[PDB]
């Protein structure tokens, strides 16, 4: 019926690169790898899934992974890696002294005055989830992962609204 695939988001070079790496881990040449190789082939390709991510991927699966499933796994993890990096860069934009912290006051301010402005209810929940009144934003990012300032603001608001949606259920 349909032709769409996550691999549509991959370049031809990536497909070839992922194919070479995958096959490098296929021992008996049956076109599949075992679940215990998944983490290592992903790392060999520059992706570092956490133990939880790996467990989630494996649960989606005779204990083997076929190539199209692997391409899908790669494409989805690459998307998450890119988003996570973008969220970190967006926070870094608002870290004026670059020390890895943002004041609760400053975070609340940029979230409500720039971009797709957070409501008082959204932002107050944000501050609650984020304080020692300093926000270690690296920790906040890891927690969410389970002008220049304008674009950065929207990155954070969309990331946070995504987190809120998941939490509402």
From Swiss-Prot:
Q: Where is this cross-link: Glycyl lysine isopeptide (Lys-Gly) (interchain with G-Cter in ubiquitin)?
A: 27
Q: Which residues carry this modification: N6,N6,N6-trimethyllysine?
A: 117
Domain EF-hand as annotated: residue spans: 13-48, 49-80, 82-117, 118-146
| Residues that hold Ca(2+) 2 according to the record | 62, 64, 69
Q: Which residues form a coiled coil?
A: none
Q: Where is this cross-link: Glycyl lysine isopeptide (Lys-Gly) (interchain with G-Cter in SUMO2)?
A: 27
Positions carrying Phosphotyrosine: 101, 137
Q: What Gene Ontology terms describe where this protein resides (cellular component)?
A: calcium channel complex; calyx of Held; catalytic complex; centrosome; cytoplasm; cytosol; growth cone; mitochondrial membrane
Superkingdom, natural source: Eukaryota
- Where Phosphothreonine occurs, residue numbers? 50, 112
Q: Which GO terms describe its biological process?
A: autophagosome membrane docking; calcineurin-mediated signaling; cellular response to interferon-beta; cellular response to type II interferon; detection of calcium ion; establishment of protein localization to mitochondrial membrane; G2/M transition of mitotic cell cycle; mitochondrion-endoplasmic reticulum membrane tethering
Xref: InterPro entries: CALM/Myosin/TropC-like, EF-hand-dom_pair, EF_Hand_1_Ca_BS, EF_hand_dom
Q: Which residues carry this modification: Phosphoserine?
A: 83, 103
Q: Cite the entry's keywords alphabetically.
A: Acetylation, Calcium, Cell projection, Cilium, Cytoplasm, Cytoskeleton, Flagellum, Isopeptide bond, Metal-binding, Methylation, Phosphoprotein, Repeat, Ubl conjugation
User: What post-translational modification information does the record give?
Assistant: Ubiquitination results in a strongly decreased activity. Phosphorylation results in a decreased activity.
Could you tell me which residues carry N6-acetyllysine?
27, 96
Modified positions (N6-methyllysine) are: 117
Isomerase: present as a keyword of the record? no
The record describes its quaternary structure and partners as: Homotetramer. Interacts with CEP97, CCP110, MYO1C, TTN/titin and SRY. Interacts with MYO10. Interacts with RRAD. Interacts with USP6; the interaction is calcium dependent. Interacts with CDK5RAP2. Interacts with SCN5A. Interacts with FCHO1. Interacts with MIP in a 1:2 stoichiometry; the interaction with the cytoplasmic domains from two MIP subunits promotes MIP water channel closure. Interacts with ORAI1; this may play a role in the regulation of ORAI1-mediated calcium transport. Interacts with RYR1. Interacts with MYO5A. Interacts with IQCF1. Interacts with SYT7.
* Similarity annotation: Belongs to the calmodulin family.
Main function = Calmodulin acts as part of a calcium signal transduction pathway by mediating the control of a large number of enzymes, ion channels, aquaporins and other proteins through calcium-binding. Calcium-binding is required for the activation of calmodulin. Among the enzymes to be stimulated by the calmodulin-calcium complex are a number of protein kinases, such as myosin light-chain kinases and calmodulin-dependent protein kinase type II (CaMK2), and phosphatases.
Q: Domain comment text?
A: The N-terminal and C-terminal lobes of CALM bind to the C-terminus of KCNQ1 in a clamp-like conformation. Binding of CALM C-terminus to KCNQ1 is calcium-independent but is essential for assembly of the structure. Binding of CALM N-terminus to KCNQ1 is calcium-dependent and regulates electrophysiological activity of the channel. The C-lobe interacts with KCNN4 channels in a calcium-independent manner, whereas the N-lobe interacts with the S4-S5 linker of KCNN4 in a calcium-dependent manner playing a role as calcium sensor and gating the channel.
What else does UniProt say about it? This protein has four functional calcium-binding sites.
Q: Write the protein's name.
A: Calmodulin-1
Task: Say which species the protein is native to.
Answer: Mus musculus
